[PDB]
């Protein structure tokens, strides 16, 4: 299907960035 | 230029994945001490 090529990067970063935010905060909560 | 279109995602993940890994380890090191 002739989809948008920046769709992949937009979806990937949309997941990746906020998720890494939360992971960073959860792990440093656990180690204190 | 007619560059490979997956080069961008390749490069972005190549940077982002291992960097995030290091940041996770550093921050939880700091909240220990």
């Amino acid at each position: 299907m002739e989809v948008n090529q920046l769709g992949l990067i937009a979806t990937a970063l949309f997941v990746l960035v906020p998720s890494v935010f939360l992971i960073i905060l959860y792990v440093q909560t656990e180690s204190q | 230029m007619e560059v490979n279109q997956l080069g961008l995602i390749a490069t972005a993940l190549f940077v982002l994945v291992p960097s995030v890994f290091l940041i996770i380890l550093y921050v939880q090191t700091e909240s220990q001490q």
Binding site: - | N4, L25, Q32
Partner: protein, 505 residues
């Protein structure tokens, strides 16, 4: 805390979580296998095994399923071109599915072993400490390896209870999965004899059973136990890595040189077949034969199967690629459509002329036409002013026998040169470059990609061997040398024997 490069050492004294980790690894590898096959099924074009075989399409695991007998799809096709077949459950799709179900089951077992790590089985009954009798484990596992190895050869490869394996004629024209009988003679060591593969697994399987039985019943000598630190699981990692990189070098070589287990219809030709003109010899052999019995030139060449002509073409030479030229070979020169025919060049004097073929070393090569004796009679010149041998001056023409341009002759110099620039690549094909938006640059085949990865991983695992071997033999000084090492011990002359304090002078 632990440095990042040591997080996984927490498993060294925890056999249960060690098993949990190994399960998760095995889950991941099987999952990959299932994912890779599904992606390949969704991208594979099965419609022409002659000019668009799997190895032109960037297929990596498809050929390994085909090698051991999986050749058809639930969708009705087979990679041999047969249609309307019914593979049963062990289609490409079913193999992929089994590896995914296996992945999921391994994942769950990993959870169980991670939680219930503290199993009495892992405790030494005398001391209450976790301990693994590694000598006996070796014997158990080796006995198992030998059962499997023997059965693989005795049942799967023979067809006694199984499909056999992929075999083909010497020119890769008629391959298929056939049962193979053992070759017990000395030709069983011929890498190109499939019967030797069968005999190997039977005989080696039996030796493995016997060795396994030995290693279950016979304890290690104390000298050897001490020398190899057989109470230290890391000595096993050290030797295991060494065996793994040994195996990795072997599979890379046989992929690159070719053997009965790397057939060219699954992986593509080898570069040596181009170096030695292997297919060109055979093609000429048949044209001579067709001519001797009186066939015309058009007839002799039209009898040449396209599949054979397509091997005599440098675009399928695995040594014509580049590291960052990604994807299927089709992405480069295109999807081959038809053989255009055999180009014959002649000068104005009727003499037949021969294009000098490109050697694999050369990204680019000049166009030089020789006579049967090797004397230069035409070329495409760079500097034009003192040109002696131009196509225009020498009256060079091109005529086609067989293929799509059969019986056609071209005389206009630019057209003739255009075919002569393709004749350096071997036989001439018509490619579809639109469909994949092919860029025109040669890529390597799966034979190349496989060889590169495995030669590289091997060399890297040699370093792993050295590292973990060192760690085993020097465990006592990992964290540093003795702060009470006395200077008489490292200075010369004090001891007769280096390091031995009982040899004082």
């Amino acid at each position: 805390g632990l440095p990042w490069y040591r997080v996984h050492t927490v498993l060294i004294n925890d056999p249960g979580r060690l098993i949990a980790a190994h399960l998760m690894h095995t889950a991941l590898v099987a999952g990959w296998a299932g994912s890779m096959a599904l992606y390949e099924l969704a991208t594979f074009d099965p419609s022409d095994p002659v000019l668009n075989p799997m190895w032109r399409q960037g297929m990596f695991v498809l050929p390994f399923m085909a090698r051991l007998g999986v050749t058809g799809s639930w969708s009705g096709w087979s990679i041999t071109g047969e249609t309307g077949i019914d593979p049963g459950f062990w289609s490409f799709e079913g193999v992929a599915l089994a590896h995914i179900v296996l992945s999921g089951l391994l994942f769950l077992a990993a959870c169980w072993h991670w939680v219930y790590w503290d199993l009495e089985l892992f405790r030494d009954p005398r001391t209450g400490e976790p301990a693994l009798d590694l000598p006996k484990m070796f014997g158990i596992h080796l006995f198992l390896a030998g059962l499997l190895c023997f059965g693989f050869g005795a049942f799967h490869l023979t067809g006694l209870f199984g499909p056999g394996m992929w075999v083909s004629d010497p020119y890769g024209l008629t391959g298929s999965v056939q049962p193979v009988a053992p070759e017990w003679g000395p030709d069983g060591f011929n890498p190109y004899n499939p019967g030797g593969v069968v005999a190997h697994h039977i005989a080696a399987g039996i030796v493995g059973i016997i060795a396994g039985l030995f290693h279950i019943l016979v304890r290690p000598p104390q000298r050897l136990y001490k020398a190899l630190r057989m109470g230290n699981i890391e000595t096993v990692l050290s030797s295991s890595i060494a065996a793994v990189f040994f195996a990795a070098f072997v599979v890379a070589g046989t992929m690159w040189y070719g053997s009965a287990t790397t057939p060219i219809e699954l992986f593509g030709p080898t570069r040596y077949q181009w170096d030695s003109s292997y297919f060109q010899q055979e093609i000429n052999r048949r044209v001579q034969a067709s001519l001797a019995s009186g066939a015309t030139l058009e007839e002799a060449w039209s009898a040449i199967p396209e599949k054979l002509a397509f091997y005599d073409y440098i675009g399928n030479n695995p040594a014509k690629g580049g590291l960052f030229r990604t994807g299927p070979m089709n992405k480069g020169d295109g999807i081959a459509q038809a053989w255009k025919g055999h180009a014959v060049f002649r000068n104005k004097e009727g003499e037949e002329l021969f294009v000098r073929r490109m050697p694999a070393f050369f990204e680019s090569f000049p166009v030089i036409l020789t006579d049967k004796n090797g004397v230069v009679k035409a070329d495409i010149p760079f500097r034009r002013a003192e040109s002696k041998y131009s196509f225009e001056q020498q009256g060079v023409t091109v005529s086609f026998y067989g293929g799509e341009l059969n019986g056609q002759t071209f005389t206009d110099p630019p057209t003739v040169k255009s075919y002569a620039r393709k004749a350096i690549f071997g036989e001439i094909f018509e490619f579809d470059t639109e469909t994949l938006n092919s860029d025109g640059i040669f890529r390597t085949s799966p034979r190349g990609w496989f060889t590169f990865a495995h030669a590289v991983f091997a060399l890297l695992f040699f370093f792993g061997h050295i590292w973990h071997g060192a760690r085993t033999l020097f465990r006592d000084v990992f964290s540093g040398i003795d702060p009470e090492l006395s200077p008489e011990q490292v200075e010369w002359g004090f001891y007769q024997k280096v390091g031995d304090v009982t040899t004082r002078r």
